[PDB]
């Protein structure tokens, strides 16, 4: 009904707090009420997507007022991807398991829709204004730049993931040269 | 509005037919063994569900899907394809198909309480009872998970294709 | 849209009232409004389908009483097809033109949907109760029996179209023997 | 409900693009003759319509159809396929495509006044004006009446595919 | 090598069936008129060809195409679709289908004399005689020259789909 | 590749000679060279198909002499399926494993082609001269009768599999009554 | 047969000498045989494609000596298209009829194959060694530049068709800047 | 005959591209571990094979398959789909793809020695050496024996589509 799901939402939101204790298994979801698992991950991803949208909006409402410098498209895309990836820092230990869960042959539609919506927001808050076939290429040309970059962060050991950010540079420049 | 209450009956009939056929296959292979009665009980439950949806389909004068002669060779091939890999290879098929059925029953009872919740409940209580009886025993190996997903992702295209066509 | 359609309906009906010497053109429509042109033909077909449904219903409601004997299936189908075809007797002069218009490569979906609904409403009042692949075959196995028969009525000259009805026999018997 | 007001802007954009390409082809073939000006005026009308629907598509953050690179070789072929048969490509292709466009404008303006007629009319008046301007000059040979139908059927199948895909 | 001498028999059987059906339709519409006898003679010729290729297919134990129940409703729809447009359906559809048949007979008799011209001629003389009898009376309006082509293209795609699948 | 494959054929033919206590694994293939494993099973199936063809041919060239009676299609199809299944009697204990191997998602084309060729060579000798859609139905209507029957023989314990043969009756009669 | 095809080829290659007087009809080929569906346009197009290939080859065998300068890609493509189009100069009267006949819905496969082979033989002598998806784009990116240009030559009246050539410039430069 | 050798080079190029891409994915996921160095040798072997077949494709003026932009997202998804399941989803993907490649190399080297065995061997020795080097390390759990098969079926369907298209 209404209260059922409206409270299951709070159940999941409170359960995903102490995930560094157990993991994305079905043990922390039920134990969170004291305060597989193929829904906790989707809920976490949706929440982080919404918060990224909100942060980009709060930042855009500053450049249309003054007191906020402007910058080219490549710099903005690098900053957006860095901002979105800096949310996976506390949960970085048990992430590859959730990434495996997200790629099973029956969860690909949902995950792909979430990725498409994230990329769409990230491009629209950068001034795309394109009604052509270029609506697709650019989107795709960014999804890769995201996915690949993620597959580095889980295996990097450099201080504050600095190495990873450097990769982003050497992966977006080649894109902005018609890659 | 009749197409909305038509597509649901058609896809439910198709899904229950497919499940009945799968259990018929698995019973044909693992018949005279120590795992017979479980498959027999599940087969009887699915025959009951099929008879109910069959009379409910005859009543409302709806159109059965055209692919029904195709779930008859693909609903029996996954009754000798699996269930020859041993017990733990047959348990991983029923769980998958029943989880798919329950997920679609949920998705189908969602869009029928938010659009018109008062012109019904001669049919909605049936869907709720069927979801409960289908999920009651769906709860009862790192590779046997993948094999389950590739079966749970086939019973989701066979539902996408069977309601439109 | 209420008054628009409520006037379009009366216009098309009053136009259809007299087409024995004017053809299914865009001319008799105005001659009726005073008192290609495929909309007129589609309206005529829909109205005759509805009246066939209503007649079959009025006939069925005389069986729950006990005043009408329950014929077999083949006899009922022959009588239903004869009843539906005997509506094309006044307009038999200019029918081939409307049949040509109804078969152009862009009017086939509508005409086919109308034919399917007619065949369904003709089989349902005969006690089908079939939920199998036999839902299709039978339907198709009747549509032919209709279409072909029509293509005889337009070129027959026997009294009372008697010949045509005989054909129906020699086309439904060979069908009720699993043909 | 945004998908409903999305699947109409997408179809309208695709259809106006196709019509613009058809007229571009017919003008490329019959350019320097006694029929040029009519096709030029129609081409200007369609460029105006396309600019309007393009700004309207940019505003609502719509998704353009993926087949657009395919109506670019099939929207120019029927500008050299026809219009090479004399002045019967400029009177059997334009009429057909404009009748198809008007029919779909009617079909859209139907299902948008019976579902929600008050959350709109910042867009519905646009559709009505476009239908009027598209049908005003669509009114201005037993074998030339089948080419028209076989073109209209294709221009309808191409609208059946632009929305869903 | 048997697949080569199998495919040609299958294509010929399917094509002759389609032609027989087209003529059956056109005779069903234009039966009692001043054109009947020509259609009757052509129908008898095609029934003869079909009986010959039918016994030849029964002999060599070949596999008939699976689409045969589809040329039965699409080989009769072009017997009331055309032939209702007057005497220019009995002079464009027949010419088109017979030119297509002759073209494919030539294409077959080409690749059977350059690969093995001596393990045959119990069948090749049959193909040659059939091509002659099919082209003898195929020789006996700028808009009809497009209907003929749009019929010939379909009668070629059908031969292709029926030969492969 | 002519004097070496003609010896691999003999390798397989001598290897499948003694498999009552060694299974279809890749060791009884080499243990037979002293005098997954899909090639062995496919070779055995092809050889048994060829021998069935030859037996049916030797039987067919016996009624042109007036020595053997004639039987309807029922008895002939029953006897054909029986004399084809009676070849699986020695290799009956290790059969379900080979049946599992034959149904993996990458061996279905080959096995299905072999089954189709067997059904064709079984129907052709029972006087089937048909060039319609009926070429398919009948074939399919027999393949089932075979497959299902096999799935009984592996789990029957009656003397000389008598039970199984009875099933065949109750599966071909209901088939030859337009089933 | 050899003599049949030889005489057909001779009739066709001798018939198109008087086409500037009758047109792409059956009358011109009959007149040429002295000493509807054409097939003559297809023969002429094949012959001109072969001659273009041969001319490009004769020109390429002059740069591997030291007598001809290697100019850029865009200039070579402009020169190739101009050379191929300067063969349609004497037949420019009756060409639109042939272009119409070449575009009927049943001659599109053959004409499209000829166009593709011409574009391939025009790109290969330009130095295109690409095994990628760029094998397609470039090819397509040239076919347009050809077809469109043709549709100008038939309606131009400037001396030496000069205007047309100018168009080619404004159609290939705009294409070489990633068009 | 040139269009007969015009198909083997294209299919070999496509298959080696797919294999290179798969190994790139698996190396991107399992890079800095104790198994990375095992995949590096295979990746270098496949890059070498790809360079050889690429120069051989440039020489004979072959046409590369049109689906190449599709094996670029499906040749990398099976490099993070598997290889995230530990060193059992990696050992089961390489074995499957290499067995498929070797099977098709055998199938090609069959129909090229029985049709014309003397107009070649500037290319056939290459195929033989490649088959040997591909099968040398393809030899180096009842549930994984199904994942391997469902990967081999895909790698065998993707070769049948890359031939024609």
From Swiss-Prot, chains A, C, F, G:
Question: Cellular location of this protein?
Answer: Mitochondrion
What is known about its processing and modification? In response to mitochondrial stress, the precursor protein is ubiquitinated by the SIFI complex in the cytoplasm before mitochondrial import, leading to its degradation. Within the SIFI complex, UBR4 initiates ubiquitin chain that are further elongated or branched by KCMF1.
Annotated Gene Ontology cellular component terms: mitochondrial inner membrane; mitochondrion; ubiquinone biosynthesis complex
Native organism is: Homo sapiens
Question: How does the record describe its quaternary structure?
Answer: Homodimer. Heterodimer; two heterodimers of COQ7:COQ9 come together on the same side of the lipid pseudo-bilayer and form a curved tetramer with a hydrophobic surface suitable for membrane interaction. These two tetramers assemble into a soluble octamer with a pseudo-bilayer of lipids captured within. Interacts with COQ7; this interaction allows ubiquinone (CoQ) isoprene intermediates presentation to COQ7 and facilitates the COQ7-mediated hydroxylase step.
Binding residues annotated for a 1,2-diacylglycero-3-phosphoethanolamine, in chain numbering: 139
Q: Know the name of this protein?
A: Ubiquinone biosynthesis protein COQ9, mitochondrial
**Keyword match Ubl conjugation:** yes
Q: Which gene encodes it?
A: COQ9
* Entry's Gene Ontology BP terms: mitochondrial electron transport, NADH to ubiquinone; ubiquinone biosynthetic process
Task: Keyword check for Mitochondrion, yes or no.
Answer: yes
Sites where N6-acetyllysine occurs are at 70
Q: What does this protein do?
A: Membrane-associated protein that warps the membrane surface to access and bind aromatic isoprenes with high specificity, including ubiquinone (CoQ) isoprene intermediates and presents them directly to COQ7, therefore facilitating the COQ7-mediated hydroxylase step. Participates in the biosynthesis of coenzyme Q, also named ubiquinone, an essential lipid-soluble electron transporter for aerobic cellular respiration.
Mapped onto the parent protein, the portion here is: 93 to 284 of 318
In the record, the note on similarity to other proteins reads: Belongs to the COQ9 family.
Keywords noted in UniProt: Acetylation, Lipid-binding, Mitochondrion, Primary mitochondrial disease, Transit peptide, Ubiquinone biosynthesis, Ubl conjugation
Where it mainly occurs, coarsely classed, is mitochondrion
Reported effect, residue 132 to K: Impairs interaction with COQ7
* GO terms for MF: enzyme activator activity; isoprenoid binding; lipid binding; protein homodimerization activity
Entry remark concerning the domains of this protein: Structurally similar to the bacterial FadR protein (fatty acid metabolism regulator protein).
Q: What metabolic or biological pathway is this protein involved in?
A: Cofactor biosynthesis; ubiquinone biosynthesis
Q: In the record, what disease is this protein associated with?
A: Coenzyme Q10 deficiency, primary, 5: A form of coenzyme Q10 deficiency, an autosomal recessive disorder with variable manifestations consistent with 5 major phenotypes. The phenotypes include an encephalomyopathic form with seizures and ataxia; a multisystem infantile form with encephalopathy, cardiomyopathy and renal failure; a predominantly cerebellar form with ataxia and cerebellar atrophy; Leigh syndrome with growth retardation; and an isolated myopathic form.
Swiss-Prot record, chains B, D, E, H:
| Stated consequence of mutating residue 10 to W | In HMNR9; uncertain significance
- Catalytic EC class: oxidoreductase
Q: How does it sit in the membrane?
A: Peripheral membrane protein
Tell me where the sequence repeats sit in this chain.
4-85, 86-165
Binding residue positions for NADH: 7, 160, 164
What are the GO BP annotations of this UniProt entry? determination of adult lifespan; negative regulation of transcription by RNA polymerase II; positive regulation of transcription by RNA polymerase II; regulation of gene expression; regulation of reactive oxygen species metabolic process; ubiquinone biosynthetic process
Name the chemical reaction catalysed here.
a 5-methoxy-2-methyl-3-(all-trans-polyprenyl)benzoquinone + NADH + O2 = a 3-demethylubiquinone + NAD(+) + H2O
Q: How is the cofactor bound?
A: Binds 2 iron ions per subunit.
Its function, per the record, reads: Catalyzes the hydroxylation of the 5-methoxy-2-methyl-3-(all-trans-polyprenyl)benzoquinone at the C6 position and participates in the biosynthesis of ubiquinone. Catalyzes the reaction through a substrate-mediated reduction pathway, whereby NADH shuttles electrons to 5-methoxy-2-methyl-3-(all-trans-decaprenyl)benzoquinone, which then transfers the electrons to the two Fe(3+) centers.
Assembly description:
Component of a multi-subunit COQ enzyme complex. Interacts with COQ8B and COQ6. Interacts with COQ9.
User: What is this protein identified as?
Assistant: NADPH-dependent 3-demethoxyubiquinone 3-hydroxylase, mitochondrial
Q: Which organism is it from?
A: Homo sapiens (Human)
Q: What is the lineage of its organism?
A: Eukaryota, Metazoa, Chordata, Craniata, Vertebrata
Part of the intact protein present: 45 to 217 of 217
């Amino acid at each position: 009904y209404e209260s059922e799901e409206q409270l299951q939402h709070r159940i999941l939101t409170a359960a995903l707090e102490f995930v560094p204790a157990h993991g994305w298994t079905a043990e922390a979801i039920a134990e969170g009420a004291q305060s597989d698992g193929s829904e906790l991950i989707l809920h976490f991803v949706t929440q982080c997507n919404t918060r990224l949208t909100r942060v980009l909006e709060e930042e855009q409402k500053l450049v249309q007022l003054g007191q906020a410098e402007k910058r080219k498209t490549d710099q903005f895309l690098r900053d957006a991807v860095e901002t979105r990836l800096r949310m996976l820092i506390p949960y970085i230990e048990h992430w590859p398991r959730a990434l495996s869960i997200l790629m099973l042959p029956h969860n690909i539609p949902s995950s792909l829709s979430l990725l498409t919506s994230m990329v769409d927001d990230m491009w629209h808050y950068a001034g795309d204004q394109s009604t052509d076939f270029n609506w697709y290429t650019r989107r795709a040309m960014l999804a890769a730049i995201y996915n690949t970059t993620e597959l580095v962060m889980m295996q990097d050991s450099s201080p504050d993931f600095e190495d990873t950010w450097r990769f982003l540079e050497n992966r977006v420049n080649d894109a902005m040269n018609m890659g | 509005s009749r197409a909305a209450v038509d597509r649901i009956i058609r896809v439910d009939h198709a899904g229950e037919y497919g499940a009945n056929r799968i259990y018929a296959g698995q019973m044909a292979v693992l018949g005279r063994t120590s795992v017979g009665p479980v498959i027999q009980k599940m087969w009887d439950q699915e025959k009951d569900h099929l008879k109910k949806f069959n009379e409910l389909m005859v009543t409302f004068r709806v159109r059965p899907t055209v692919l029904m002669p195709l779930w008859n060779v693909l609903g029996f091939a996954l009754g000798a394809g699996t269930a020859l890999l041993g017990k733990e290879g047959a348990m991983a098929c029923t769980v998958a198909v029943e989880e798919s059925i329950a997920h679609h029953y949920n998705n189908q009872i969602r869009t029928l309480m938010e659009e018109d919740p008062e012109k019904y409940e001669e049919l909605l209580q049936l869907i709720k009872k069927f979801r409960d009886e289908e999920l009651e025993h769906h709860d009862i190996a790192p590779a046997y998970a993948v094999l389950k997903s590739i079966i749970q992702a086939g019973c989701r295209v066979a539902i996408y294709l069977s309601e439109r066509l």
